[PDB]
Design an enzyme around this catalytic site. Structure first.
Site, short mmCIF file in Angstrom:
data_model
loop_
_atom_site.label_atom_id
_atom_site.label_comp_id
_atom_site.label_asym_id
_atom_site.label_seq_id
_atom_site.Cartn_x
_atom_site.Cartn_y
_atom_site.Cartn_z
N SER A 42 66.83 12.84 47.74
CA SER A 42 66.75 11.78 48.68
C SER A 42 65.25 12.18 49.43
O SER A 42 64.59 11.07 50.23
CB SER A 42 67.66 12.02 50.04
OG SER A 42 68.90 11.32 48.89
N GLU A 140 68.10 4.76 42.27
CA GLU A 140 69.13 5.19 42.78
C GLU A 140 70.71 4.93 41.66
O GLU A 140 70.11 3.63 41.86
CB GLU A 140 69.51 5.32 44.47
CG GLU A 140 68.60 6.84 44.84
CD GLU A 140 69.48 7.61 45.23
OE1 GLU A 140 70.53 7.99 45.02
OE2 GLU A 140 68.74 8.38 46.34
C1 LIG Z 1 73.34 11.27 44.78
C2 LIG Z 1 74.13 10.68 46.08
C3 LIG Z 1 75.23 9.50 45.95
C4 LIG Z 1 73.58 10.88 47.33
C5 LIG Z 1 72.61 10.41 47.32
O1 LIG Z 1 71.24 11.91 47.28
O2 LIG Z 1 71.07 9.71 47.44
N1 LIG Z 1 74.11 12.36 48.10
C6 LIG Z 1 74.92 12.62 49.32
O3 LIG Z 1 74.24 12.08 49.95
C7 LIG Z 1 74.56 13.48 48.47
C8 LIG Z 1 74.74 13.48 47.40
S1 LIG Z 1 74.54 12.50 46.48
O4 LIG Z 1 76.57 11.77 46.76
O5 LIG Z 1 75.18 12.86 44.51
#
Ligand SMILES: CC1(C)[C@H](C(=O)O)N2C(=O)C[C@H]2S1(=O)=O
Ligand SMILES: *C(=O)/C=C/N[C@@H](C(=O)O)C(C)(C)S(=O)O
Ligand SMILES: *C(=O)/C=C/N[C@@H](C(=O)O)C(C)(C)S(=O)O
Ligand SMILES: CC1(C)[C@H](C(=O)O)N2C(=O)C[C@H]2S1(=O)=O
Lengths: 265, 265, 265, 265
Positions: A42, A140
């Site tokens: 992120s 994403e």
């Molecule tokens: C990719 C995610 C959905 C999202 C993300 O980074 O976009 N994440 C969090 O809030 C921790 C990691 S995650 O759950 O792998």
């Protein structure tokens, strides 16, 4: 030697740690796996917002974007609430930084335009800042689940730190647009247990976190000493050996940040 | 290689810095002028309360002590308010620790009894704890304005740290009395800008500060890592060369404490 | 006669204010629109935790709950960080109260079971406490967007005050579970500028805030006088006439809380 | 109305309460025994300092005043420490306000000069401010032990409040000297449990306390609303009939100040 503590923290947490602090006029640069590649996760949402601000006038922030429920694919606490009303580019910026909204980042990527949903245009923006290492290839949430060793959707603590320095401390954006980016990172809500937790309270801290699979946990930050001296701190880590479902360790990033603060003191 | 930053801070603040952290089972001891003498200042009030607790039953804390306006010889924010009502030995302990009350300390020394208003008895208590260096010769406020080079009313960071370790971490007091001293230091109000300010927020800090003339500023503390590992941090400093009216620099203790936190991380 | 200041504050902030303080053994009850309906918003999370505590033994708090990224539908500062690790019912309670986590509240409702994801079961718990007015119909974040005049997801300051009184002051929970709820509300982080800001510092304040659209701002609290007399203060407000995007005014709740403090003094 | 709470506090705390708040442009004046005489006690040191500033140039603050141990008549936590080095008139001002130093007040009265050790000159300064009610006849600590009904060394909440209004808010001193007086009252150390304790934290409070025999407890203050509206709050009390050794009740002044805060909200 400080690099002895970093490898000690790597062994204690069973992870691979990457730290880079660009050298200032008074102190030397801190390096540990600084030129090794880590996943963006992120943290790419910080230069993404600066990309929209750079290529668009301030009135572009009032443009309303409508989207469907089929566009929600990542963690989106803000985009899921405005599916019927839509969100302006400004709100997409606020959500992409402070709450790390996934689809808000995907919509901003689309606002960049171009092939691959705007990932090609985004990497091109990183190239204008002199960064020829980082690269964004997916959207994403695919950019978080790349396997270790794969160079797609990766940056380095050396590369991302210097990018963040030009955006916040440097003049890579005019001050009117530079102030909007800093205020969003200053009121971030997703990084309370990382670099913010490793520095004393009288240190100002703005940051944009990153978390992914394989125990990935990043945090790029801009800190201010109690006297007002700014620094750039890029801390990234993963635990590829623990598997795909390996748990990320926020304590690792907090402990490493305290080691950096001891040197900068 | 940490002593290079300490000597850099001494030159930066025009002061003499003394630091000692007793070695734990895992980490080594931090020393910087650890065996050099610094003035006790109000830091003696911590083992003073422990001395009164040790020699008396818990019911002795309810004994009411009356005093006159002539006894208010130093800054006494709590004793000045109960000159008509009087204060119990327990309240004198609370004022002597949390508010660093001077008159509360002088009355507690008198409660110890003996020659010199109990200063000989106080030094005797430190000798029984294995402290063969420290010595208390005057009362408040004479003990804070001893001339440089004079060994009266002085301790060393090595000696004061080991005393504090036995009182808080060791079994030099029964747990019912050990909890009273720790809780009083936990609610201290005079050291928010010293060791407390140098450590991150998720570290628990109990402390007793000390300030006098000649730019003297001390802070003895017991810190707890976020995982729960306790440490003892003894930081003392003076600026004798600057004269009697030299201003103390609290930022020096905060900066040194931040350097200690980086090593203990 | 106190209601003259309340109506003056309504005119100053362009809002509708609701205040109720249940009468104690010594003082009379304070009422202002006490039987008018205001939106629950996040105040329902306080009796929600009490509902889960009531129906399950203390060991049930260790049960680990797993959830997906699609469950993160509202602002969830704690649920966003533990999507991969999962959170226990105890951690869900802590997040739902202290950080007003949205997804934590929705998961706790599911643990209650029943129709509509547990909203029917939650309303049933309030009915056993004698509350025949309140009602929960939706989940997060829909319960905040209800239009004015709609009775869905609404309570009254009269009803919520008596519910909070039985949970904290009364014996509607055994002391082992009652102490857990009180400690969580005591360490709340979302209401420093509301009832807490309206009362002097030497008054202990536990509370659970609530904020939604239409300028909605609630705060249910239990305060303790410096001598130890407990009171229950339910303050709610909205600005439905200002539209959906009306800004909530926290200063109104802080000012109203100060007026109540003058009466209870 | 509000005067019923004051009579409730009088009967509860077994004291005689005097309250006066000068009316502002927006609010009305608060009066309760406002024109009844209470003993000055230490509150006279506030207009005493303003007297030295008014008739003397700014360079007069560097004049060094020497005194003997025979001059230390009252509680003097600062004057007791400088019996050999001496103190400048400026240091006498700081000690007389922040720590309510007795010998510091007597030395400033002597610096005023004139009959009765300068008490005649001090009342003369009060007369130039339009106050024809107050009067100072004795020095410290005799001015505190006057019997009830005696008009010597007494003021009224009405008279002292308007004096404080011109000294802090009005132009009874040029701004160069007005800033010195305000900063000294802002850093007062003797009144944390009186008017300061009765107002919420987001209210700024400067004050000069007063305590004497017969359970006398005064506190003159200047408070600021969270938006920045200044008010003058004069609270005085004694407990005649309880005897010479009657205990003062600080909780009365704190509770009364909360009633004032409720009205001004
Ligand atoms: C990719 C995610 C959905 C999202 C993300 O980074 O976009 N994440 C969090 O809030 C921790 C990691 S995650 O759950 O792998
Ligand atoms: C503890 O060391 C202090 C007593 N008072 C000091 C303070 O800073 O309050 C001094 C230096 C004023 S003192 O009493 O010599
Ligand atoms: C308590 O239930 C509510 C929180 N509501 C708002 C918030 O402050 O987090 C939102 C943003 C979830 S909302 O009402 O759209
Ligand atoms: C000296 C005082 C300011 C004031 C005085 O006498 O002026 N005293 C009391 O009523 C007890 C002492 S005091 O409060 O320190």
């Amino acid at each position: 030697d400080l690099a002895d503590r970093f490898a000690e923290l790597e062994r204690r947490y069973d992870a691979r740690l990457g730290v880079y602090v660009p050298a200032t006029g008074t102190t030397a640069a801190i390096e540990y796996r600084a030129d090794e590649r880590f996943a963006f996760c992120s943290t790419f949402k910080a230069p993404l917002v600066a990309a929209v601000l750079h290529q668009n006038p301030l009135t572009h922030l009032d443009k309303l974007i409508t989207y469907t429920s089929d566009d929600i694919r990542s963690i989106s606490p803000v985009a899921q609430q405005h599916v019927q009303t839509g969100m302006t580019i400004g709100q997409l910026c606020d959500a992409a930084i402070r709450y790390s909204d996934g689809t808000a980042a995907n919509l901003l990527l689309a606002d960049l335009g171009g092939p691959g949903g705007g990932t090609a245009a985004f990497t091109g923006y990183l190239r204008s800042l002199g960064d020829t290492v980082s690269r964004l290839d997916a959207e994403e949430p695919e950019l978080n689940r790349d396997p270790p060793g794969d160079e797609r959707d990766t940056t380095t603590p050396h590369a991302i730190a210097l990018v963040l320095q030009q955006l916040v401390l440097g003049n890579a954006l005019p001050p009117d647009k530079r102030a909007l980016l800093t205020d969003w990172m200053a009121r971030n809500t997703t990084g309370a247990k990382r670099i913010r937790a490793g520095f004393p309270a009288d240190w100002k801290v703005i940051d944009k976190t990153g978390t992914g699979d394989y125990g990935r946990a990043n945090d790029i930050a801009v800190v201010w000493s109690p006297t007002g001296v700014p620094y750039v701190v890029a801390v990234m880590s993963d635990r590829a050996g623990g598997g795909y479902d390996a748990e990320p360790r926020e304590a690792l990033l907090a402990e490493a940040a305290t080691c950096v603060a001891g040197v900068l003191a």
